[PDB]
């Protein structure tokens, strides 16, 4: 049992200078011991990994999976504590920076040992618009990289 994710919300950064970019808010939340497999909840966690909070909530409210409701609840709680506890003025101005699942303390039952599986859902929200996805590299990027590779070659094994 390690509970670092909870402790990650107690970091007090020093106050900033006027000539310094505004540090975006960072919120960490998790739910422990969810009666669900980490393998199944990995899909739901991956689905929402760069979405805005509103998009993620929309996606999860229409997933048929059991873990969708649980992740939705965790996200709503995170949004509430963001606006209230962590000084995030806009509910909309959040995005899922991190969304993973770990394994919990699973139980063992006798049938023939079978495992009652539990898991943790971890999320980190950051203040601001979701970062735009990386554009697919063009032919110009490919050609530039190839020419650089050609230019970087040396006369091997000599003076």
């Amino acid at each position: 049992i390690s509970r670092k994710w909870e402790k990650k919300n107690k970091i007090v950064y020093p106050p900033q200078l006027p000539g310094e970019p505004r540090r975006p808010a960072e919120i960490y939340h998790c739910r422990r011991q969810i009666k669900y497999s980490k393998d199944k909840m990995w899909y739901l966690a991956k689905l929402i990994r760069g979405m805005s909070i509103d998009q993620a909530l929309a996606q999860l409210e229409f997933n048929d999976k059991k873990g969708a409701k649980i992740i939705k609840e965790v996200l709503l709680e995170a949004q509430d504590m963001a606006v209230r506890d962590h000084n995030v003025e806009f509910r909309s101005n959040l995005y899922i920076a991190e969304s993973t699942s770990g394994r919990g303390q699973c139980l063992k039952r006798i049938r023939g040992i079978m495992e009652k599986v539990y898991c943790h859902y971890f999320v980190k929200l950051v203040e601001g618009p979701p970062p735009p996805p990386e554009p697919p590299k063009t032919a110009v990027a490919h050609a530039k990289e190839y020419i650089q590779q050609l230019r970087s070659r040396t006369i091997v094994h000599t003076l």
């Binding site: 209230r84 506890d85 000084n87 003025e89």
Partner: protein, 38 residues
Amino acid sequence: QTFTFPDLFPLYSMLEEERQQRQSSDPRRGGVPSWFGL
């Protein structure tokens, strides 16, 4: 004669006096501590 079973079974001051002195968080303050007079 007749019998019916009878109906048997028919420090906090400061806690309670501070219980009416919540002065709950004002929504319009937005997290700023209310202690300061500024």
